[PDB]
Design a protein around this ligand. Structure first.
Ligand SMILES: C[C@H]1O[C@H](O[C@H]2[C@H](O)[C@@H](O)[C@@H](O[C@H]3[C@H](O)[C@@H](O)[C@@H](O)O[C@@H]3CO)O[C@@H]2CO)[C@H](O)[C@@H](O)[C@@H]1N[C@H]1C=C(CO)[C@@H](O)[C@H](O)[C@H]1O
Ligand SMILES: *[C@@H]1O[C@H](CO)[C@@H](O[C@@H]2O[C@H](CO)[C@@H](O[C@@H]3O[C@H](CO)[C@@H](O)[C@H](O)[C@@H]3O)[C@H](O)[C@H]2NC(C)=O)[C@H](O)[C@H]1NC(C)=O
Ligand SMILES: *[C@@H]1O[C@H](CO)[C@@H](O[C@@H]2O[C@H](CO)[C@@H](O[C@@H]3O[C@H](CO)[C@@H](O)[C@H](O)[C@@H]3O)[C@H](O)[C@H]2NC(C)=O)[C@H](O)[C@H]1NC(C)=O
Ligand SMILES: *[C@@H]1O[C@H](CO[C@@H]2O[C@@H](C)[C@@H](O)[C@@H](O)[C@@H]2O)[C@@H](O[C@@H]2O[C@H](CO)[C@@H](O)[C@H](O)[C@H]2NC(C)=O)[C@H](O)[C@H]1NC(C)=O
Ligand SMILES: *[C@@H]1O[C@H](CO[C@@H]2O[C@@H](C)[C@@H](O)[C@@H](O)[C@@H]2O)[C@@H](O[C@@H]2O[C@H](CO)[C@@H](O)[C@H](O)[C@H]2NC(C)=O)[C@H](O)[C@H]1NC(C)=O
Ligand SMILES: *[C@@H]1O[C@H](CO)[C@@H](O[C@@H]2O[C@H](CO)[C@@H](O)[C@H](O)[C@H]2NC(C)=O)[C@H](O)[C@H]1NC(C)=O
Ligand code: CL
Ligand code: CL
Ligand code: CL
Length: 845
């Protein structure tokens, strides 16, 4: 009866240390491990729920679940309702609820399915098979179902040892199944392994032998532990709500991601300028110093689209104010930035100063009047500590607070026309535990199961769990705080400006990408953290938050010149690129380094800017099709199992492989190359030539001034001329990099719109062009042409993989004025005068 293999034992004492006698009293098995793995575990016969009265409807299945014997947790809900909805051929959805009481739910908006579902009667379980190969994807029969008021546990076998997701944590892309506990409870803590961080995404993608995959999303916003076992298997442990589970069938990993984003929302489309270089630090104390940054960057030929300010601008570190010493002419500074073709961003915190005299600080006075703040047991606002001192916290689930936030934003924008919002401390972060007045002693503050959060209490670094919000207690809504503020800030920026919003958030939840982007927080200026940013940037793209990046050159401590060169090189490939720096630290602006470092840094930014039309096109695909912008090799080559554990290289879209140096003092790097031809992007003119891979590791030369970037054969990349801003670069002539397959084939595309407007796709206010190389010709296909795509000038076409030197080169039937061929690199470089919107034909022989 207790003969269960070590790796398949499920913890029967997740709540406390237990003795043999007690464990056996719980009706469990006690077998110490030989060397983590639970000593107290469930026998196959342990009491669970029983499936009764299973019935079928047009929507799917319905049943009753009954538990006869109570568990060791208080408040078992002995009678449950099961609902299974077969929503599409790719998406299966099931819920387990208490049919007698509404419980907290998260607010969110051959012809056969790829899955099949079956049920185990006793103990109850849900089994999900991939139809095509009969593989078992989900099997909840492996462990008992727990459904207590403050404890939900649902377990499943996993199809392999390869699983990714469950943000936000500092870890390899592929998670460890060796008795790993992964805690989701938003928390202000500098990124360090094994710790719950700023965001929580209860979703995972599981790979299957052969390259197929599936995803599971548990729509639950409560504090939770996700436990992984080497069998392999997984256990969801939540402290509240209900079980609301979606299964996505793929079969391709990209389709799994797309299918999940169908439920939580496709990434919002950023403004083009948002994809340029952002520069910030805590410590730009005055508008004179802030203007110097732009001056010094500009002087040194370093592009910069957006200048930022941290707390410096505010009056005594309060939102929606600016001080009259260093920032007396803040409005004029921001107006000047605009005149020059640049944008402006600044930090906003959620917490509002509550200690000023009545009537002296409108945001608080108005907020108090309209009841926008989270309240305590006695109904008064909860007061904690953040930068300005005593603070009240807005409740972004309260419609009136949404309206107040819109007003405060609009009013401040009337004074200083900022172009977006950097929203920080929105876990929400608290400098003291719970509140100035502590927290009461109840079941929400002291629950029967506390997940493995840093600090051992839900109140740590945040507000009281039993505090009141409009939709529910903070206990249920905490993981949504950041998200709700992001939603509120999204709408606020739309009303204030009338163009696409640009919101960068620290705290996030699943579905965050529909409204905002993210940066990874207070990472150290270390090689370790530079390396760790690659898996985390990829993780967030898999979770539908493509607009993500880490502070370039690091936030904490002092960076080194070498590290900042390497970080800027890799950083230029973060979909969101910002260099940010702490108050105490040494300057790390591109212009504050030696000339060789500056050159290396200038080259990185130049290449990013040249690549912007492609990057933007990738974001379009993310916005319209649930694609990822930055992706791991396995998403693109799932059937090559050697890619599965690669997370220190990244792809932009399908065709651009970036292989960064991530360690000090290296002049080479070893990267995995999937089967195919990979052309070195350094052969393309910007204002070994080819790696032929069977699917193998390749050692590449990579001196300090170099980052390896390769372009996949069979792909065409749109590029554009240089500029210190996107306002400037968007007016330049464009180019194509054409990477030919051995058979002389290639495909690519360009999306172009005004770059700022709302409802572009809905109104059809965009131009979409496809490029095709075939049989020594290059043509375009006009999928859509509008006024926005007008005047787009194509002046250069670079063809890679041209074996023999051509005797003639024609553009629309006429020999081109001049071209060059290099027999050493196989590169054909052609000068033309064409329009992306006009049908053209270029040929050679
Ligand atoms: C700026 C940053 O300050 C706060 O975090 C700091 C902690 O309060 C300090 O105690 C210290 O944390 C150390 C840990 O205690 C230690 O155990 C180890 O982990 O090393 C840590 C690093 O020294 O330093 C922390 C960072 O300086 C605050 O909690 C955090 O949220 C603040 N960061 C945000 C605030 C601003 C200012 O508006 C922005 O500049 C940042 O981008 C934000 O992320
Ligand atoms: C879903 O998970 C459950 C639990 O892991 C699996 O059911 C279990 O299957 C095992 C092995 O197939 C069963 O053990 C065997 O029982 C038979 C029947 O008496 C016996 O002839 C063998 O000697 C062996 O002991 C076990 O009874 C069964 N347990 C339960 C609770 O059902 C099931 O296989 C999984 N489903 C799928 C599709 O993988
Ligand atoms: C709910 O939140 C409110 C704040 O909105 C809390 O009110 C606070 O209550 C404490 C004492 O219960 C007050 O402390 C007192 O301060 C005065 C001086 O101002 C001092 O003379 C007293 O001896 C005492 O230290 C505190 O001032 C007050 N906060 C504010 C902003 O007025 C209330 O306690 C919270 N309720 C619960 C149950 O936590
Ligand atoms: C499982 O269902 C049976 C039958 O339920 C009835 O038929 C259903 C389709 C629906 O119309 C229900 O409203 C009906 O009650 C349950 O057995 C019945 O229990 C009721 C209430 O105690 C009792 O009045 C009847 O005599 C029973 N009828 C029969 C045929 O046995 C049973 O209780 C359900 N089990 C669970 C665990 O919910
Ligand atoms: C980050 O560096 C600052 C400054 O470092 C000093 O100045 C540099 C130009 C360089 O020459 C360094 O070697 C210097 O130490 C550090 O702040 C200094 O801290 C030291 C010792 O703790 C103190 O005696 C100095 O007065 C400080 N100088 C200034 C200008 O503030 C800071 O501690 C470093 N941080 C880390 C995490 O290493
Ligand atoms: C912008 O660049 C200027 C020019 O290098 C910097 O000005 C120098 O600052 C140092 C302090 O480290 C002084 O010792 C020099 O006298 C300054 N030179 C001049 C010509 O002013 C300035 O600090 C830079 N500003 C920023 C914000 O990076
Ligand atoms: Cl013992
Ligand atoms: Cl509720
Ligand atoms: Cl290998």
């Amino acid at each position: 009866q207790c003969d269960v293999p070590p790796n398949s034992r499920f913890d029967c004492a997740p709540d406390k240390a237990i003795t043999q006698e007690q464990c056996e009293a719980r009706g469990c098995c006690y077998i110490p491990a030989k060397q983590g793995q639970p000593w107290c575990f469930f026998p196959p016969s342990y009491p669970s729920y029983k499936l009764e009265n299973l019935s079928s409807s047009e929507m799917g299945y319905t049943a009753t679940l009954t538990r006869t014997t109570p568990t060791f947790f208080p408040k078992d809900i002995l009678t449950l309702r099961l609902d299974v909805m077969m929503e599409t051929e790719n998406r299966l959805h099931f819920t387990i609820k208490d049919p007698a009481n509404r419980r907290y739910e998260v607010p969110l908006e051959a012809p056969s399915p790829l899955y099949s579902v079956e049920f185990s009667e006793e103990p109850f379980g849900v089994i999900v098979h991939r139809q095509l190969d009969g593989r078992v994807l989900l099997n909840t029969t492996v462990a008992p179902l727990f459904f207590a008021d403050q404890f939900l546990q649902l377990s499943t076998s996993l199809p392999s040892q390869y699983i990714t997701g469950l943000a936000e944590h500092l870890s390899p892309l592929m998670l460890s199944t060796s008795w790993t506990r992964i805690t989701l409870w938003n928390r202000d803590l500098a990124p360090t392994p094994g710790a719950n961080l700023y965001g929580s995404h209860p979703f995972y993608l599981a790979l299957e032998d052969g390259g197929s995959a599936h995803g599971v999303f548990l729509l639950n916003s409560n504090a939770m532990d996700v436990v992984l076992q080497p069998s392999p298997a997984l256990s969801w442990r939540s402290t509240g709500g209900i079980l609301d589970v979606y299964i996505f069938l793929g079969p391709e990993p990209k389709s799994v991601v797309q299918q999940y984003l169908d439920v939580v929302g496709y990434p919002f489309m950023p403004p083009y300028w948002g994809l340029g270089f952002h520069l910030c630090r805590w410590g730009y104390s005055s508008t004179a110093i802030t203007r110097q940054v732009v001056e010094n960057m500009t002087r040194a030929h370093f592009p910069l689209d957006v200048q930022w300010n941290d707390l410096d601008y505010m009056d005594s570190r309060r939102d929606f104010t600016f001080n009259k010493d260093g920032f007396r002419d803040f409005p004029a500074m921001v107006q000047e930035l605009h005149q020059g073709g640049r944008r402006y961003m600044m930090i906003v915190d959620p917490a509002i100063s509550s200690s000023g005299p009545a009537g002296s600080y409108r945001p608080y006075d108005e907020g108090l009047r309209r009841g926008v703040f989270i309240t305590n047991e006695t109904g008064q606002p909860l007061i904690g500590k953040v930068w300005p001192g005593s603070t009240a916290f807005p409740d972004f689930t309260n419609p009136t607070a949404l309206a107040w936030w819109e007003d405060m934003v609009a009013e401040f924008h009337d004074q200083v026309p900022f172009d977006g919002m950097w929203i920080d401390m929105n876990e929400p972060s608290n400098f003291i535990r719970g509140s100035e007045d502590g927290c009461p002693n109840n079941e929400l503050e002291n629950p029967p199961y506390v997940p493995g959060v840093v600090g051992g209490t839900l109140q740590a670094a945040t507000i009281c769990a039993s505090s009141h919000q409009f939709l529910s207690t903070h206990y249920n809504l905490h993981n949504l705080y950041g998200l709700t503020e992001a939603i509120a800030s999204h709408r606020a920026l739309v009303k204030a400006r009338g163009t696409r919003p640009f919101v960068i958030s620290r705290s996030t939840f699943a579905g965050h990408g529909r409204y905002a982007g993210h940066w990874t927080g207070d990472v150290w200026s270390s090689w370790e953290q530079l390396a760790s940013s690659v898996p985390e940037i990829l993780q967030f793209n898999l979770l539908g938050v493509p607009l993500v990046g880490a502070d370039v050159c690091g936030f904490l401590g002092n960076t080194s010149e070498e590290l900042c060169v390497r970080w800027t090189q890799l950083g230029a490939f973060y979909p969101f690129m910002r260099n940010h720096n702490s108050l105490l630290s040494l300057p790390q602006e591109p212009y504050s380094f030696s000339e060789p470092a500056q050159q290396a840094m200038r080259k990185a930014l130049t290449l990013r800017y040249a690549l912007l039309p492609h990057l933007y096109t990738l974001f379009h695909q993310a916005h319209v099709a649930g694609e990822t912008v930055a992706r791991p090799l396995f998403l693109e080559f799932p059937k090559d199992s050697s890619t599965w554990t690669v997370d220190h290289q990244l792809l932009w879209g399908e065709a651009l492989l970036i292989t960064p140096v991530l360690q000090a003092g290296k002049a080479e790097v070893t990267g995995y190359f999937p089967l195919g031809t990979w052309y070195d992007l350094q052969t393309v003119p910007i204002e070994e030539p080819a790696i032929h891979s069977e699917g193998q590791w390749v050692t590449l030369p990579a001196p300090l001034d170099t980052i390896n970037v390769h372009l996949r054969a069979g792909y065409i990349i749109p590029l554009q001329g240089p500029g210190l801003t996107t306002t400037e670069s968007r007016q330049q002539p464009m180019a194509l990099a054409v990477a030919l397959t051995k058979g002389g084939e290639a495909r690519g595309e360009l999306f172009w719109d005004d770059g700022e407007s709302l409802e572009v796709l809905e109104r059809g206010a965009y131009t979409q062009v496809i490029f095709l190389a075939r049989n020594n010709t290059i043509v375009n296909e006009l999928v859509r042409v509008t006024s926005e795509g007008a005047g787009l000038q194509l002046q250069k076409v670079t063809v890679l993989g041209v074996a023999t030197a051509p005797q003639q080169v024609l553009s629309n039937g006429v020999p081109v004025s001049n071209f060059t061929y290099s027999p050493d690199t196989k590169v054909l470089d052609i000068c033309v005068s064409l329009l992306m919107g006009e049908q053209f034909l270029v040929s050679w022989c």
